[PDB]
Ligand binder design. Structure first.
Ligand code: 1N4
Length: 280
């Protein structure tokens, strides 16, 4: 009854480190996690590489394993990231669950309606949504600011973007086509790229998952970043653990999460991994 569980690196929720080759054992607050890695860029031939995983979501998984009394084989997703339907097929962590390669998915995984059609989710345990990060000093009200609505009213035309394939991009693409097609010229490879662009005056605003942006603003070195809610209340949600549609384990996973919330364990984890120092 070893459970196959998929995850994905995104600090501080999931952080991946190398194993000690002397022992090949994960130690401290880490747990073993493997990744299938290709031999070359020609075919899908590959081998699994042992790594170690830690972070807020890993600590949640550890608590769940302890409380619900299961063991698991944790692996990192190799095709896609969080989850997107591409060419009519779900990839990422969502895909691993949909096609029953994983019983659960644990990480910075946003609950939404489209995903809920094909997987079940636990109760949310981290609040999230769409937020906007800017350099401290920049003034925006949220995504309805004229700077976002009419970017060519500004010099240079207002520069804002997100990271492709996340639920944030999907929420914009599905509802505001002009905004989406304007934004794509400012696509960011990841959060770290975007933060550098903001701090060096090469980008005006970065639109992304709120939980991660709140975290990054909270401990930016120099406290040079500000996050504000998009105001897209329709997108307010949370991270959840994804399970198979109709999973018999949602009941017990939820009970455990609710136990942790009630007894202060969740509060302790938030203090340990998420709380910031930068005043807003
Ligand atoms: C690398 C993109 C991550 C992202 C952007 N928005 N949202 O919601 C996510 C991620 N939390 C997700 O579940 O798709």
């Amino acid at each position: 009854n070893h459970l196959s569980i998929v995850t994905l690196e995104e600090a501080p929720f999931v952080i991946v480190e190398d194993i000690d080759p002397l022992t090949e054992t994960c130690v401290r607050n880490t747990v073993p996690c493997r990744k299938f890695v290709k031999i070359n860029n020609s075919t899908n031939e590959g081998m699994n590489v042992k790594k170690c995983c830690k972070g807020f979501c890993i600590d949640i998984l550890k608590k769940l394993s302890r409380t619900v009394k299961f063991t698991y084989d944790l692996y990192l997703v190799t095709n896609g990231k969080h989850g997107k339907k591409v060419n009519n097929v779900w990839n990422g962590m969502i895909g691993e669950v949909v096609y029953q390669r994983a019983v659960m998915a644990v990480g910075s995984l946003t609950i939404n309606e489209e995903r809920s059609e094909v997987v079940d989710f636990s109760v949310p345990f981290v609040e999230t949504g769409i937020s906007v990060m800017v350099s401290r000093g920049t003034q925006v009200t949220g995504l309805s600011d004229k700077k976002f609505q009419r970017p060519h009213d500004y010099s240079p035309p207002f520069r804002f973007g997100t990271v492709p394939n996340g639920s944030t991009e999907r929420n914009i693409r599905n509802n505001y086509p002009y905004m989406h097609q304007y934004m794509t010229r400012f696509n960011q490879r990841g959060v770290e790229d975007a933060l550098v662009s903001l701090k060096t005056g090469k980008l005006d605003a970065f639109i992304y998952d709120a939980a991660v942006l709140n975290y990054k603003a909270g401990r930016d070195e120099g406290c040079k970043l500000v996050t504000i809610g998009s105001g897209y209340i329709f997108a307010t949600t949370g991270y959840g653990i994804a399970l198979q549609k109709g999973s018999p384990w949602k009941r017990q996973i939820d009970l455990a999460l609710l136990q942790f919330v009630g007894d202060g364990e969740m509060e302790e984890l938030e203090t340990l991994w998420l709380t910031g120092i930068c005043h807003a």
